[PDB]
Design a protein around this ligand. Sequence first.
Ligand SMILES: CC(C)CCC[C@@H](C)[C@H]1CC[C@H]2[C@@H]3CC=C4C[C@@H](OC(=O)CCC(=O)O)CC[C@]4(C)[C@H]3CC[C@]12C
Ligand SMILES: CC(C)CCC[C@@H](C)[C@H]1CC[C@H]2[C@@H]3CC=C4C[C@@H](OC(=O)CCC(=O)O)CC[C@]4(C)[C@H]3CC[C@]12C
Ligand SMILES: CC(C)CCC[C@@H](C)[C@H]1CC[C@H]2[C@@H]3CC=C4C[C@@H](OC(=O)CCC(=O)O)CC[C@]4(C)[C@H]3CC[C@]12C
Ligand SMILES: CC(C)CCC[C@@H](C)[C@H]1CC[C@H]2[C@@H]3CC=C4C[C@@H](OC(=O)CCC(=O)O)CC[C@]4(C)[C@H]3CC[C@]12C
Ligand SMILES: CC(C)CCC[C@@H](C)[C@H]1CC[C@H]2[C@@H]3CC=C4C[C@@H](OC(=O)CCC(=O)O)CC[C@]4(C)[C@H]3CC[C@]12C
Ligand SMILES: CC(C)CCC[C@@H](C)[C@H]1CC[C@H]2[C@@H]3CC=C4C[C@@H](OC(=O)CCC(=O)O)CC[C@]4(C)[C@H]3CC[C@]12C
Ligand SMILES: CC(C)CCC[C@@H](C)[C@H]1CC[C@H]2[C@@H]3CC=C4C[C@@H](OC(=O)CCC(=O)O)CC[C@]4(C)[C@H]3CC[C@]12C
Ligand SMILES: CC(C)CCC[C@@H](C)[C@H]1CC[C@H]2[C@@H]3CC=C4C[C@@H](OC(=O)CCC(=O)O)CC[C@]4(C)[C@H]3CC[C@]12C
Ligand SMILES: CC(C)CCC[C@@H](C)[C@H]1CC[C@H]2[C@@H]3CC=C4C[C@@H](OC(=O)CCC(=O)O)CC[C@]4(C)[C@H]3CC[C@]12C
Ligand SMILES: *[C@@H]1O[C@H](CO)[C@@H](O[C@@H]2O[C@H](CO)[C@@H](O)[C@H](O)[C@H]2NC(C)=O)[C@H](O)[C@H]1NC(C)=O
Ligand SMILES: *[C@@H]1O[C@H](CO)[C@@H](O)[C@H](O)[C@H]1NC(C)=O
Length: 842
Amino acid sequence: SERMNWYYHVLARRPYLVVVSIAVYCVACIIVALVLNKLPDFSDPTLGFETRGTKIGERLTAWYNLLQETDHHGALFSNPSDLWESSPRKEYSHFVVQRINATDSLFDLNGLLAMCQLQDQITEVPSYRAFCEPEMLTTECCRPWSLPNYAAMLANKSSCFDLTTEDVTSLHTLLLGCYEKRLNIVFNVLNFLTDFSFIVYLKYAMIFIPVAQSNRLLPLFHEWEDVELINELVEVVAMDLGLENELFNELLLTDVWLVSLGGTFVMASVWLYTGSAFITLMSCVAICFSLGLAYFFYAIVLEFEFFPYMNLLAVVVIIGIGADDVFLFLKIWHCVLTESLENIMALTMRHAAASMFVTSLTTAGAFYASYSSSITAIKCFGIFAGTVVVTNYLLMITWLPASVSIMERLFKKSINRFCQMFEECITKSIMNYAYLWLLIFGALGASSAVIVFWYPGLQLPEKSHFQLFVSKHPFEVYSSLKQQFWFEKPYNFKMHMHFVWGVQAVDDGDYTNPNSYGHLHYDNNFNVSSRPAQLWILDFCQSVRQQPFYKELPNCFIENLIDYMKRRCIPCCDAQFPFEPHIFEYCLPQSISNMYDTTFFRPGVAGPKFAEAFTPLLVKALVIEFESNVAYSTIYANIRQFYESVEHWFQMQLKTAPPELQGGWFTSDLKFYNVQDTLSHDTFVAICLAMAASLAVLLCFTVNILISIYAVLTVSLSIFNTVAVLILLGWQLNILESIAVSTAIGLAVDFSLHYGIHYRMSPVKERLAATQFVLSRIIGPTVMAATTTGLAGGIMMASNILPYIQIGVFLVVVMIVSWFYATFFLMSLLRVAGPQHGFLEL
Ligand SMILES: CC(C)CCC[C@@H](C)[C@H]1CC[C@H]2[C@@H]3CC=C4C[C@@H](OC(=O)CCC(=O)O)CC[C@]4(C)[C@H]3CC[C@]12C
Ligand SMILES: CC(C)CCC[C@@H](C)[C@H]1CC[C@H]2[C@@H]3CC=C4C[C@@H](OC(=O)CCC(=O)O)CC[C@]4(C)[C@H]3CC[C@]12C
Ligand SMILES: CC(C)CCC[C@@H](C)[C@H]1CC[C@H]2[C@@H]3CC=C4C[C@@H](OC(=O)CCC(=O)O)CC[C@]4(C)[C@H]3CC[C@]12C
Ligand SMILES: CC(C)CCC[C@@H](C)[C@H]1CC[C@H]2[C@@H]3CC=C4C[C@@H](OC(=O)CCC(=O)O)CC[C@]4(C)[C@H]3CC[C@]12C
Ligand SMILES: CC(C)CCC[C@@H](C)[C@H]1CC[C@H]2[C@@H]3CC=C4C[C@@H](OC(=O)CCC(=O)O)CC[C@]4(C)[C@H]3CC[C@]12C
Ligand SMILES: CC(C)CCC[C@@H](C)[C@H]1CC[C@H]2[C@@H]3CC=C4C[C@@H](OC(=O)CCC(=O)O)CC[C@]4(C)[C@H]3CC[C@]12C
Ligand SMILES: CC(C)CCC[C@@H](C)[C@H]1CC[C@H]2[C@@H]3CC=C4C[C@@H](OC(=O)CCC(=O)O)CC[C@]4(C)[C@H]3CC[C@]12C
Ligand SMILES: CC(C)CCC[C@@H](C)[C@H]1CC[C@H]2[C@@H]3CC=C4C[C@@H](OC(=O)CCC(=O)O)CC[C@]4(C)[C@H]3CC[C@]12C
Ligand SMILES: CC(C)CCC[C@@H](C)[C@H]1CC[C@H]2[C@@H]3CC=C4C[C@@H](OC(=O)CCC(=O)O)CC[C@]4(C)[C@H]3CC[C@]12C
Ligand SMILES: *[C@@H]1O[C@H](CO)[C@@H](O[C@@H]2O[C@H](CO)[C@@H](O)[C@H](O)[C@H]2NC(C)=O)[C@H](O)[C@H]1NC(C)=O
Ligand SMILES: *[C@@H]1O[C@H](CO)[C@@H](O)[C@H](O)[C@H]1NC(C)=O
């Protein structure tokens, strides 16, 4: 312990040196990272929710690169000839309206005058005059066509002068007369405006303005948010615009300013606890420098080219965690002052470094275990947050004690009395009433296990939408109110299976960014023209005709080629189905040419693919399409059954094939299903890794076995109760939720670690004295840490984005649950049956 004495002497005797050096280095790294790496573009929020590296992901990447290589460039070419030498539509912007006093049908006069007022309110907005999409060049901003407008249109007069009880009732008699006289397009248009349940009492109406859906009309959206259109009787409840991602970005960038408020509150907490402004200032600086160093190591050093939006969530975490190691430090420091600076620094560092290290290690280990996932955004988030935590810990060790020593170089009643009363009440409660808390929190643990595991588990998302905004946001309300209207159904597109042979199922790209798919490799053992290959391809088609999932051209080209052979002469003419391979390769491109030269020209993925090696071409690949009876569903079990069945049958069929064609693989629109499977598997893996990290850290630092078991129990019950609370709040499995379930461990184990470490650290080995010592020393820092984290999240609750709200719920829930379990369940366990006299000590 001689070298560490020198480090403590440096921190105590020359702190300005460490401060200046850290500041210079971190500011330089920030300068480099922000100047050299161009800034993150969140133009598309659903970027990196794909599972690169898996079987399905490999196949999908290969299939994508194939289409990327079909026609625009590359030796491949589908056709060898290319190788040789007014009424509305959905794209307009539309508002969905409902009536909210009487709450009767919208249709009658009062609703129509309300919609007149709505239209006059919308069109009075200034920017609308620029976006109006004027037509006819008559110096007119064209009017929005809706219910009252059409009611006036059937009449000769204009709108808002309806005289409805004779006029609107005539419009009613018109609609009841006809169903699907067709004056201009009134019936068809108006039956597309209103909902299914119009035949009387349309639950919802819709207003169409002459404005295309674009990314440009965001100030229009904000101007409409100013005047909320709720005037007396009607409510604009779902305004669809092609504006989800732009508003998502803008709201992220505003809600980080809102994160600044939680940062301010955490700084206020540090000021109240410590009693100086210098330490809170330098802790803010430490949080910022940790973020900067992490962004530098992420972008510049590690060359991670993709920065998700989820990485910003790490900021919301670290403002909670970064100040925590402050509260633990100065406490011990003040204790050492009660019982020059070099010795004090040595003692408080020997007492605090274990706990600080342990907390940051558990959090960073969970975050880095998130890198085990196949999804890319999870990998990026894991690496970023782990780097942020590790930077925060190094910043703690170096920059915090120097700031402490500088504070002492620089150098309340109600606060002390309140903290004393709080400590006294908590201590007396735990010591007197222990079995009560043990029973209560064990019951809650069992209930939460039943909730999280058996019946209402973390069910997968089945109507995904990759939701972004709050449920009571118009862009998200509209997605629920789509199906009620007519022009939202295309009936359903059946799924179409592809079988590909020429190319390998490999992803030779960087799995971290979604814009490096790599280069496809062609299988060189691939020979279609062989006679056994012809026989097997024919039997394959005719076998697909047998199987149940089949549903009924370019696909199964071999049939069209046999037809091209069947035609009598007057080379390719007057042949049979089994014929010579050079005749095959010479006549097949001619068959495709004559089939495309037909005026049908069915453009599809199906067919063979040729390359230059008339000149003799060679087939590098083919894809065989078949329409399947299964419809495109979002749920997991249907596509699981479909994919498993078809893959099993195909892999059984391939064994019949020669070794030439034994390189084929299956594909469909299996992106979301692949995500769904990998998400559960990777969540389990990340939970296992983080749990192992926490268990190891426990066994090393709180060397006793019983304390480790009690801590594992407390953490497991805390995570159970948290996940259960989230489920009852309406949480389903998703990327953020898998992340949060993996990181709840490393967030929650901190409190248990503090208590177990200080319990081992007690001089008196009796459980009673050890518990008193533990509580008296460490009750305050845990409280202020949990408070800072929960407060940082609970301000994010006041946001319109779902990620930030979800983090608010998660941080608040985890911190409160973990504190109440570790403080009452674990300490009661130690008070009643804790280890004394070194029982079960390593
Ligand atoms: C930049 C990041 C990696 C954080 C680490 C900070 C280092 C740059 C600090 C930590 C220990 C510091 C050293 C601790 C003490 C000394 C002894 C000192 O020697 C003297 O005796 C001059 C003063 C005198 O004699 O009064 C020269 C600087 C040096 C090596 C300091 C140089 C800078 C060091 C390596
Ligand atoms: C330590 C924690 C609190 C993270 C805070 C990081 C800040 C340095 C970032 C967060 C949001 C950023 C702002 C988000 C967007 C803009 C608009 C930008 O001007 C533009 O018109 C182009 C960008 C756009 O319009 O999206 C000028 C800087 C500014 C205010 C950025 C300034 C720096 C801010 C405050
Ligand atoms: C001050 C210390 C704690 C450093 C903290 C890092 C932040 C200053 C960085 C991290 C990610 C950066 C963002 C990643 C990039 C964007 C998008 C950009 O908006 C645009 O759409 C313009 C670019 C384009 O459209 O081409 C506005 C800045 C912003 C939010 C950057 C603002 C500053 C952020 C929050
Ligand atoms: C430094 C502190 C925070 C402790 C944590 C160390 C991490 C850097 C370790 C812990 C678990 C390690 C992971 C455990 C296993 C895997 C899977 C591996 O991918 C594979 O698919 C091949 C191995 C397999 O069969 O799983 C990639 C590395 C990775 C994530 C390891 C990367 C580094 C991790 C995140
Ligand atoms: C939220 C649920 C899961 C339990 C945790 C909430 C605590 C703030 C409560 C629970 C029981 C409360 C205790 C129940 C009764 C008393 C006796 C009381 O004794 C007195 O000296 C004055 C009043 C009296 O008891 O006569 C001191 C506070 C205390 C231990 C209370 C302190 C705060 C406790 C630990
Ligand atoms: C072991 C089991 C019984 C877990 C017990 C934990 C309780 C403290 C949780 C379980 C369900 C939670 C409730 C679930 C949902 C809500 C609604 C919430 O108000 C809202 O309007 C927002 C809800 C949303 O939008 O999802 C107020 C809190 C409350 C009652 C929560 C309060 C705390 C409750 C009772
Ligand atoms: C202490 C030992 C004896 C274990 C006791 C376990 C009970 C506390 C479990 C068993 C059946 C459970 C219930 C089974 C299922 C439901 C439905 C559930 O309703 C919902 O719709 C919430 C889901 C959502 O909104 O996402 C509310 C919880 C509840 C009654 C569970 C509450 C807790 C119960 C009573
Ligand atoms: C004891 C420690 C762990 C702190 C946790 C206390 C919670 C009960 C507090 C913390 C912040 C509070 C939140 C801060 C502000 C808001 C916004 C409020 O709704 C608004 O949108 C009004 C503000 C706006 O204009 O956006 C709903 C309650 C809520 C989430 C509060 C609910 C309760 C929260 C989560
Ligand atoms: C170990 C035992 C004592 C568990 C107790 C934990 C509570 C402090 C947690 C459980 C559920 C939490 C609540 C879950 C969510 C809500 C709703 C939130 O307001 C919202 O509108 C969010 C809903 C949305 O925007 O979608 C205000 C905070 C609150 C009551 C949270 C406050 C703190 C609660 C009551
Ligand atoms: C696929 O395999 C067949 C036989 O295994 C190859 O056919 C022969 O080689 C040349 C090709 O022009 C010709 O002599 C005959 O067509 C075949 N040889 C015989 C019958 O002895 C065929 O070339 C292979 N495909 C490719 C693209 O090379
Ligand atoms: C105007 O009124 C006449 C007489 O009822 C009717 O035939 C005509 O269709 C009306 N005009 C419009 C645009 O509906």
